[PDB]
Amino acid sequence: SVRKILRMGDPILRKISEPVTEDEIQTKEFKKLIRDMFDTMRHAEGVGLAAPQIGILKQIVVVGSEDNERYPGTPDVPERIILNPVITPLTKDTSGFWEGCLSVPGMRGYVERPNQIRMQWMDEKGNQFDETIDGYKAIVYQHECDHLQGILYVDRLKDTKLFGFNETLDS
C-alpha cells in the first residue's frame, strides 16, 4: 500500500538512520516494507525513496523511474533496492541539477553534486556490491543516501537565489 510521505519539518527526516541486519531482509515485515516503499514511490512519481521519508530510520533506499512526469528530461532509471549504502566522491567535477524531493513538495533547487562516486551496498538478496557510479545515477543515489544521514537537498542548495516553486520556475 502507499505510506504517508513525511514533509520537511518533521524531525525524523533529520535523524540518522541505522543499518539493516542480514537477519531483517529475510524477515517478513521487511519484505512488506520494500513493497510499500515501492508502491509509495511510484504513486508519487518519484525517482526514488528513503525509508525515513515515511517514518522508518532504516538504511533502506529504493529507486526506479521509466518515463517520469515529475522530472521530464532525466533518463529512465532501473528499479533497485539499495541497503546500508556508503558513498565516496571519486572527483571534484560536479553536475548541476534543479533537484526536488517528495518530502519537499512543489519546489526545485539547483544543487551541485560530484558526478563520479564509489558506492557499496547490499540487496534484498544479501549480495554485496561495490561499483563506481556516474552521471544521473550517482546524483540520485547521493540524493537518497543523504536522507539516511538526515540531509535534504536544501542543505546543499548551491545558492538560495536558485530555489523556488515549480509553477514559477518553468513559469
Active site (catalytic) residues: 144
- What is the total residue count of the chain? 171
Distance of CA 59 to the CA centre of its chain: 11
Q: Please select the residue that binds its own copies; options are 67, 69, 78, 160, rule is CB under 8 A.
A: 160
CB of 72 to its own copies, least distance (A): 18
State how far the Cα of 80 lies from the Cα of 64, in Å rounded to an integer: 7
Nearest to 46 by CA among 99, 86, 87: 99
Place of cell 530555489: 163
4 binds its own copies (CB under 8 A): no
For Zn ion, which is the closer residue by CB, 97 or 128? Answer: 97
State how far the Cα of 12 lies from the Cα of 10, in Å rounded to an integer: 5
By CB under 8 A, the count of residues binding its own copies is: 20
Binding-site sequence positions for Fe cation: 101, 143, 147
Q: Which residues are at the interface with its own copies (CB under 8 A)?
A: 7-10, 14, 107, 152, 154-155, 157, 160-161, 163-169, 171
